[PDB]
Ligand binder design. Structure first.
Ligand code: NAP
Ligand code: NAP
Ligand code: LGC
Ligand code: LGC
Ligand code: ZN
Ligand code: ZN
Lengths: 357, 357
């Protein structure tokens, strides 16, 4: 079968050939439909994040996948079920408490593999296998855009933890600020528009000149575009307002620290970005005083698990159809797979199509 | 009546005389028994925190008080009840949503007064009045050390919020690290020893040379003393272990940032210190990456409300008697009030006695 992989030393994704896998007991065989591409995949290709499987020359990419079950084997899945795989799997040493208690998303470094990212091959192959417990059934009609379920689930987890941090008092937020106009940030902005917390004012930070299709999406959602070149995060409360909820999706470390200054009293910032090393001079006193005297919280979040994927299927149905059309700028057949890794300003979310239902 | 106050421009606390107050409707008249002194009071005397009441030449100090009801007026309190007042009161402009919903501890700057700290006189007077709703009845036998209920309540709130931040997954901590060996830090260390979360290993950071009575208390609680001059917070995991829970009570901004490096995966730091301005070069990338990839949280907390004071009465009963004897290094009659504001290494928690039951 064909797969899309990065090879050690090499700079770009290439096609390789591998044998079709066979499911072991408790696993199903899945025929890949579509696999999404995101910022993390680019960071994996560049060497900034993740790592190869032990004793392998390559890493099959892709962690945002939707497929169809072709052989249920000895599982309770049915032939033709549409499934989305979770990303984390137990490491070489075997299972551990995080997997046994069904919270692998909380496992630390070295206690997991992430398919397509660290220590295990991803889903950009014609077929793959997975254990039934890591395959989430989704409604058949979400098959075409089912690669969005994984990134949606990322935000479902982040919101669960951020909101939990505010659960000891009566918190009623009205403003939300998304940092970053990538596919994760834009998806999250749309999710916040339909969130039960009832946000009245939405804002999204980027650094693009008009005309730009990410700006168009932000404004079409009735949100305000904030240009960080004009208004840095720390200055936002002077120009606009203090933000009850901040979701960071830039991977820029300055935003992790400065977000505290933009938060309203009793607010929380959720941090999702995978940053590079970076040192600078911080007013630590300002950071410290704001956190304490205004009862603020910062919560980091990575990965997601089954319940978050399930929640994502509900959120998906609430998203405007125009938004999903505008977000997904290209779905490319395997024959043109290279196009999916192009990253210019007009490329928002891409995917590679391996097969159709 | 006599009161202990700081006067504008002046450097030290002095005795002043004021008329005995009269309770309005819904208020009781309380005869002050004992009022504690803490780090915040010293910061108020120095001008680093708080502020005077509008149109007043002075501020009566003291926010940690226990008293006896002498006139219940038209309240449901009874003559002779032992009470501890809460600290926050509505500002000049009147009540607001935070007070109406019974969460004044969440009110931002300008939406509260704090008696003895900002905008309103404290409790270092022979008598004071308060609304019934802000007077917490405590068991009569806690009268002698009842000024500890307020600082205990501070930690009760901080723990509620920190633990709430971890409530979306199965968190079972085993290690806790208290930063600071002041009266708040030491009290909190003892509370953690009896906490239901079941901490096995306790640690407390200070910067004293032996012999020192704060070191003695830490070791007598079966905790490990960490000297920050030898082992800074960021290096603690190399020398000792990663900490599931960190409670910051130094007011040193470096600790607010560095605590993230000392946290175990999925851990939370609670920040309580009231810091001074301070800038330095931070590895922001390290901060950001740890928060995200290891699902960490930081929560700030200030003040406390009735439910926290109630909880404190239960915690009080669990604290070892030897510990309370060692923590309270002097209770001074009003005649020797100056002694209570002495701050040398051997002074831990002090109080001023105005009267006895
Ligand atoms: N925590 C998790 O489990 C998890 C899951 C998914 C993704 N992530 C991380 O989340 C981040 C976003 O993911 P993504 O797929 O949306 O990445 P992306 O497509 O690269 O989006 C990042 C966006 O941030 C913008 N940006 C960067 N610095 C900025 C600045 N200083 N001011 C304003 N905008 C700035 C970029 O704008 P320009 O294009 O103009 O440079 C870009 O559009 C990445 O770091 C990714 O690794 C984490
Ligand atoms: N959030 C709230 O509602 C609230 C409530 C109460 C108190 N607080 C704050 O909490 C903090 C502690 O209160 P407290 O009454 O316990 O104050 P404190 O008596 O002044 O105790 C602070 C302790 O921290 C130690 N310390 C300072 N810097 C250090 C460093 N770099 N390394 C190791 N130890 C260091 C000091 O040691 P040395 O004596 O050796 O200098 C001192 O013993 C203060 O900032 C106070 O304002 C906040
Ligand atoms: O993009 C991602 O990066 C994360 C870190 O590799 C991983 O945990 C998530 O499953 C994935 O969505
Ligand atoms: O020491 C304190 O400082 C806090 C800030 O002034 C105040 O809110 C608390 O009630 C008090 O315990
Ligand atoms: Zn992704
Ligand atoms: Zn106090």
């Amino acid at each position: 079968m064909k797969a899309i992989a990065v090879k050690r030393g090499e700079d770009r994704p290439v096609v390789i050939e591998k044998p079709r896998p066979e499911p072991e007991s408790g696993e199903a065989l899945v025929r890949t439909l579509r696999v999404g591409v995101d910022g993390t995949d680019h960071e994996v290709i560049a060497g900034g994040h993740g790592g190869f499987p032990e004793g392998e020359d390559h890493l099959v990419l892709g962690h945002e996948a939707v497929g169809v079950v072709v052989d249920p084997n000895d599982t309770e899945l049915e032939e033709g079920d549409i499934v989305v795989p979770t990303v984390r799997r137990p490491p070489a040493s075997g299972t551990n408490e995080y997997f046994e208690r069904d919270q692998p998303d909380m496992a630390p470094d070295g206690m997991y593999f992430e398919r397509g990212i660290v220590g295990a091959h991803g889903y950009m192959s014609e077929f793959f296998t997975s254990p039934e417990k890591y395959l989430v059934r989704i409604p058949r009609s979400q098959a075409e855009l089912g690669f969005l379920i994984e990134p949606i689930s990322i935000t479902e987890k982040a919101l669960e933890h951020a909101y939990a941090s505010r659960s000891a008092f009566d918190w009623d937020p009205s403003s939300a600020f998304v940092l970053g106009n990538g596919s994760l940030g834009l998806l999250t902005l749309a999710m916040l528009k339909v969130d039960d917390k009832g946000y009245e004012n939405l804002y999204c930070l980027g650094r693009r000149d008009r005309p730009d299709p990410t700006i168009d999406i932000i404004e079409e959602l009735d949100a305000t575009y904030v240009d960080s070149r004009q208004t840095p995060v720390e200055d936002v409360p002077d120009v606009y307002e203090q933000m009850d909820f901040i979701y960071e999706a830039t991977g820029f470390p300055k935003h992790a620290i400065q977000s505290v200054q933009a938060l309203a009293p009793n607010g929380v910032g959720a941090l999702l970005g995978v940053p590079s090393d970076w040192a600078f001079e911080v007013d630590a006193g300002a950071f410290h005083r704001e956190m304490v005297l205004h009862n603020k919280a910062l919560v980091g979040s990575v990965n997601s698990h089954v319940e978050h994927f399930e929640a994502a299927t509900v959120t998906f149905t609430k998203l405007p159809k125009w938004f999903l059309e505008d977000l997904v700028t290209g779905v490319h057949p395997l024959s043109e797979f290279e196009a999916a890794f192009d990253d210019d300003d007009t490329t928002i979310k891409t995917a590679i199509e391996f097969s159709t239902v």
